[PDB]
Ligand binder design. Structure first.
Ligand SMILES: [Zn+2]
Length: 200
């Protein structure tokens, strides 16, 4: 029948991480293609999570997700209303705000959260899905300009990753880049204060 053939969106699946806990930033893959697809449909992810920044996938996109204050956050435009796969099965979103382009799930067992920035610094660092650390000058609440031009393609799939202050604390969640002729000049991000307001 038409109803009995209706498919369900899978879960978001954690497929790697950006390791920032050492002296070197680098990407790690923890699941390959077949395993990602299976885990998406069951919603059951056996892998132990570690770290603050996850690399996540849906069937159509790969992007990032960042743990701050006990919630793993990402962009709505990547995750939609999807559950995330976990050891206990699919986990429903704790927070969803399309107007902020923000979703959040309870942070997975084994993950750690970044500490929100208290130092007020306007010199930020964007962490990409390829573990590139890109200096960004903050221009106000939710914006920053790149210190050096990069092609907009270098930032593809980094939505949901962190903007960190010089100390490595969280200032915000990367959402979108502004470009001209394919060259990224500025970023838009969801500030940590806005996450906290969502939580309150
Ligand atoms: Zn700071």
């Amino acid at each position: 029948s038409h109803m009995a053939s209706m498919k369900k969106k899978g879960s978001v699946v954690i497929v790697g991480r950006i390791n920032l806990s050492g002296d070197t930033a680098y990407a790690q893959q923890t699941r390959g293609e077949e395993g990602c697809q299976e885990t998406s449909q069951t919603g059951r992810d056996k892998n132990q999570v570690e770290g603050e920044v996850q690399i996540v996938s849906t069937a159509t996109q790969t992007f990032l997700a960042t743990s701050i204050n006990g919630v793993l956050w990402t962009v709505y435009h990547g995750a939609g209303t999807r559950t995330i796969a976990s050891p206990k099965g699919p986990v429903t979103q704790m927070y969803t705000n399309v107007d902020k382009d923000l979703v959040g799930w309870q942070a997975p067992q084994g993950s750690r959260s970044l500490t929100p920035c208290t130092c007020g610094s306007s010199d930020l660092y964007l962490v990409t899905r390829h573990a590139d650390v890109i200096p960004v000058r903050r221009r106000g609440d939710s914006r920053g300009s790149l210190l050096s031009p990069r092609p907009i393609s270098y930032l593809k799939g980094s939505a949901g990753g962190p903007l960190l202050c010089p100390a490595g604390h969280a200032v915000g969640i990367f959402r979108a880049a502004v470009s001209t002729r394919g060259v990224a000049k500025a970023v838009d991000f969801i500030p940590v204060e806005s996450l906290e307001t969502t939580m309150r």
